């Protein structure tokens, strides 16, 4: 073995990324004049992987904070070989990609 583990893991994480993009892209359609949502996304994209305080009362979509805080509670079928920190890095990378596209940088 070795191939299947890594291949499965990367495909599951791609599935989760697709879900993150769907939910965040819809949510960004209704920002306010202060760009509250965009700013919280930008902050998320560089967030300390050990941080949780922001998620207590965050404008981020509920799925995003639930997946960040405890991904194996949010989706209890998630394999344990996918770490909390791997999920948090995935959330950060997705937030970064979305943010650059949304601000017409990319």
């Amino acid at each position: 073995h070795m191939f299947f583990k890594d291949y499965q893991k990367k495909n599951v994480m791609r599935l989760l990324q697709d879900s993150l993009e769907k939910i965040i892209n819809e949510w960004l359609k209704t920002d306010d004049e202060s760009h509250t949502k965009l700013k919280s996304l930008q902050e998320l994209s560089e967030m300390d992987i050990n941080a949780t305080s922001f998620a207590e009362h965050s404008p981020l979509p509920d799925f995003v904070t639930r997946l960040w805080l405890d991904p194996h509670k949010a989706l209890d079928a998630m394999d344990k070989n996918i770490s909390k920190n791997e999920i948090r890095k995935l959330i950060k990378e997705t937030a970064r990609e979305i943010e650059l596209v949304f601000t017409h940088q990319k």
């Binding site: 073995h1 191939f3 299947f4 890594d6 291949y7 499965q8 990367k10 495909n11 599951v12 791609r14 599935l15 989760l16 879900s19 769907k22 939910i23 799925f63 949010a74 989706l75 209890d76 079928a77 998630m78 394999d79």
Partner: protein, 375 residues
């Protein structure tokens, strides 16, 4: 069999039989994820059980993706392994030459995988005649031609103002000739134009010709389709063949590609005939030819003659970018066997159809559980 050709036969057979299960994504996380993106579709009054059940019934979650890039990534992972695929994906593309010779020369008789990015030429299709004092690049519509008193410029998709090299006299003649109020903000390329009509129509035609000629040296290329081509070496006396593999965004899946046998049908063209069609896609100047070839090579099976008609006629130039790397059949066949063992262990059945049904049952039960929990 331990040949590249057997690699082809195996990946085709497995995708044909198992569709989305070839990703190795377990049914339970598939269903839980589907619930998380479906909670809003659940009717919120009535009794919860059958609202949830109704959304679970119309879920398409076991139907495979139709993302071309995802299918190409899946092919690369399976045939190269994950590290090899990542290295291949980060590596450089080459633009296919007019006769396709650089790709042909990149196909020695070994087991090879080609990855292709198709690009379309995203040139401006509109112009505005406007006084310079009113032209603001920060707010004007981007990817558009602007005609000022003595200048002709292109505001590109990035908001950069690019001068199109015409003289003061040329641009002023154009500006002065285009006086009809409805043509101050209009289309560049009119199928029914004619300069012998009037000086105005003369100037509109001439401006279109100038822009088209200048654009040929401006990079308006943008990626538009993704696919792969497996070219096993010839290990018997039979003529060597290639096999294109694809999904098409919003149009069809890799499983539908194989089950319609389009990989094989296109393989019948032969390596040279297929590459000749691919090269003609980049050299032709006729939109009917471009459309017909694009449909032949890239439509869902059976849609070849309606894929690129009407609204979808291929008016813009295309180009083909490619990269090539060697496939080791020992690695690819080991990878595919590991996927097969996962499927047989976790979703047992007497045939592939039954195993697919078990996967769907397990995913739907997971989705039902997750939706009931969130509600």
């Amino acid at each position: 069999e331990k040949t590249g050709l057997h690699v082809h036969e195996k990946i085709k057979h497995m995708v044909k039989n198992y569709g989305t299960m070839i990703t190795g994504i377990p049914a339970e996380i598939l269903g839980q994820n589907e619930a998380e993106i479906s909670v809003g579709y659940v009717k919120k009054m009535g009794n919860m059980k059958e609202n949830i059940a109704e959304v679970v019934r119309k879920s398409e979650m076991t139907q495979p993706t139709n993302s071309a890039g995802k299918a190409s990534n899946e092919v690369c992972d399976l045939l190269l392994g994950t590290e090899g695929a990542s290295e291949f994906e980060k590596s450089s593309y080459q633009v296919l030459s007019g006769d396709g010779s650089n790709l042909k020369g990149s196909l020695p008789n070994k087991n090879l995988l080609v990855r292709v990015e198709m690009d379309r030429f995203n040139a401006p299709q509109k112009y505005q005649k406007i006084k310079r004092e009113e032209f603001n690049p920060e707010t004007a519509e981007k990817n558009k031609i602007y005609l000022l008193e003595d200048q002709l410029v292109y505001l590109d998709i990035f908001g950069k103002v690019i001068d199109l090299g015409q003289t003061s006299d040329t641009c002023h003649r154009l500006f002065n000739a285009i006086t009809t109020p409805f043509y101050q903000n209009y289309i560049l390329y009119d199928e029914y134009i004619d300069p012998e009509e009037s000086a105005e129509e003369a100037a509109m035609f001439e401006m279109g010709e100038i822009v088209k000629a200048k654009m040929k040296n401006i990079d308006c290329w943008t990626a538009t389709h993704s696919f792969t081509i497996f070219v096993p070496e010839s290990d018997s006396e039979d003529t060597r063949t290639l096999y294109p593999y694809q999904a098409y965004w919003t149009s069809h899946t890799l499983q539908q590609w194989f089950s319609g046998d389009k990989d094989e049908k296109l393989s019948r063209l032969g390596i040279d005939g297929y590459i000749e069609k691919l090269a003609l896609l980049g050299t032709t100047t006729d939109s009917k030819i471009r459309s017909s070839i694009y449909g032949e090579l890239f439509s869902p099976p059976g849609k070849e003659h309606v894929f690129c008609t009407g609204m979808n006629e291929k008016f813009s130039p295309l180009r083909v970018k490619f990269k090539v790397t060697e496939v080791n059949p020992e690695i690819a066949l080991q990878n595919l066997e590991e996927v097969q063992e996962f499927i047989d262990t976790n979703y047992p059945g007497e045939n592939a159809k039954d195993q697919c049904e078990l996967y769907k049952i397990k995913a739907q039960e997971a989705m039902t559980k997750q939706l009931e929990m969130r509600l």
